[PDB]
Point group: D2
Amino acid sequence: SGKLTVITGPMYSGKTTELLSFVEIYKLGKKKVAVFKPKHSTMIVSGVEAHVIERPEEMRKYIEEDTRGVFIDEVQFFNPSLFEVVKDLLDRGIDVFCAGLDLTHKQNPFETTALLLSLADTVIKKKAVCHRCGEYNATLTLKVAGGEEEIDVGGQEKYIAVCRDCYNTLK
Amino acid sequence: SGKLTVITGPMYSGKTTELLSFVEIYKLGKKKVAVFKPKIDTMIVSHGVEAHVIERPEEMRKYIEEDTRGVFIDEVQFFNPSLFEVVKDLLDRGIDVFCAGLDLTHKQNPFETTALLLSLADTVIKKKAVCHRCGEYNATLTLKVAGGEEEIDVGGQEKYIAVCRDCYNTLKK
Amino acid sequence: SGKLTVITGPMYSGKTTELLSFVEIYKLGKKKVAVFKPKHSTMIVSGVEAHVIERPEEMRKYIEEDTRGVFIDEVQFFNPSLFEVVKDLLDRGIDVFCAGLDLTHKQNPFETTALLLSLADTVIKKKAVCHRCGEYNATLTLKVAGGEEEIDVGGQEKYIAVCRDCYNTLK
Amino acid sequence: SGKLTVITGPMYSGKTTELLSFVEIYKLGKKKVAVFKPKIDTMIVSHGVEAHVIERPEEMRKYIEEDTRGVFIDEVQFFNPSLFEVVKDLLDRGIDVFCAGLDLTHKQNPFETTALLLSLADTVIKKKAVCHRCGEYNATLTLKVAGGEEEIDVGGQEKYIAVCRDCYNTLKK
Ligand SMILES: [Mg+2]
Ligand SMILES: [Mg+2]
Ligand SMILES: [Mg+2]
Ligand SMILES: [Mg+2]
Ligand SMILES: [Zn+2]
Ligand SMILES: [Zn+2]
Ligand SMILES: [Zn+2]
Ligand SMILES: [Zn+2]
């Protein structure tokens, strides 16, 4: 069977970097891959070309008979139907690697990532450097600008990575 | 802060064994612990330590003391999803939490409480079992072999086997 | 090929316990094993029956054509010829699991364990609870009774596990 | 105390890449670092950071400051085995040390300096490469394909390939 590896953690933790490392492993082995990201900028960069898609059901079109690995970034933004699509790929012998956030900036679970963590054969929790104390112990994201909304695409203009004690102090 | 470690995997994969190893670590260090299991058909034993048997996660609070350093919770799949917020509060108070539970039902649906705790976790340990069909150390699923289709159904080897994905798919055909 | 897993750390770190866990995995799978310990008490207990042997060369006698795993405890006490004997087993498709101390109580390397760490496919460093501070951070063994000699079979009557800061404080 | 992390494995397995990831972690935290590589045919680059090029491990001491928090050493197989005692002293002073180097020569003999550092390590990270022969992510060995039999012989892909054990044994036959 295929194996599912889920890469998760807060922002700035190297999730996309690790996902791309796995893509390179497969390419070096001359194993066919399919790389996806949710919706139009086709670049996965921390780069490889990715298929930008709205729904997990759309992945089927791009998966060929000798596809060996499927790589999906920003999984927290996909519909939870991703769980059954991924189960089907594993059942077909295809390895799947997913990267995405585990928690929102308000420490609520991202549903789709949670479901994939339950299906995973391997889970890699990534850490970041804490923006406040500088230790390699950041497991949370704190929102520093913009509104309080939990869906808000952005980078350093809106978000920092913090450890739990720094998150609680700053709040 | 406290750290959350979630130990998960199918049946027979050594989850309670690992949870008990962590309880021993804290006890050896003379750190106070609190150990919990759900009420649903007092010892946590892999084959063991005594545990508080509780219904609601919020009941843990009755047993957590000022100097409690570690909280250990077995069979987390059977707790109400409010366990997520109870655990977060413990971590914020500097208490380390170790949870063990199944990730997937025998139908390969997520156990939602375990899934929420995986989201919160600082460290996730996926455990494997020996596959009942092929003997490889590659079993990641549980298959139900007696007792009807219910996903909440307490039992052991009379009811459930650990299998790898290929073997699960073979046996289901 | 076979894979080599080396389990190392100070005393009281669960090395033998982990080695026995792997033995059980193989037995549950109905895979033939051969279990060795250096020299006459044939028990490996933290139990399974072990072959008690003087030299690594003696392992050959006990290894059958359908042996799938070889398990060796207290490797620090074996001759460094163990490195080539283990390489040969891996070459034959046999998995090997070794447990042993990495450092003496004087923080000198055990030669045989060092050589096996270089050959290993996987290394598991085990920790103990520090006898002094109670944290799960002990990586060293300190000798508390008997003489200063570096070869001295014993348990709690002679040795404690400590973290690096506690070792330095106590010395 | 400081902790020692040793990253090891055959060529092409991402050892320097991982070492550089750790250097970045410390730099992001505004922690002073000291980075070293051996003199033997200034940048550490995986493809990078500037490094002090030194002969003897004891030369590191010239560059380590009062507020140095992390020491990073690449190609440790090429250093004198006294590196073991130099590193122990750094750990005792509270300085974290990260070493990357080959575990085995192309003849599958141990690199002794790496072996000593593996003994001392708090954490060991064995890295794998893609096998040049079969394409699986299972290469744990390096095989020499040009340049005579010497075990101290600087070079890259013109001289060395990463292989799995079965492929190494096949190619050697
Ligand atoms: Mg990303
Ligand atoms: Mg259990
Ligand atoms: Mg032992
Ligand atoms: Mg390098
Ligand atoms: Zn912080
Ligand atoms: Zn199976
Ligand atoms: Zn201590
Ligand atoms: Zn190969």
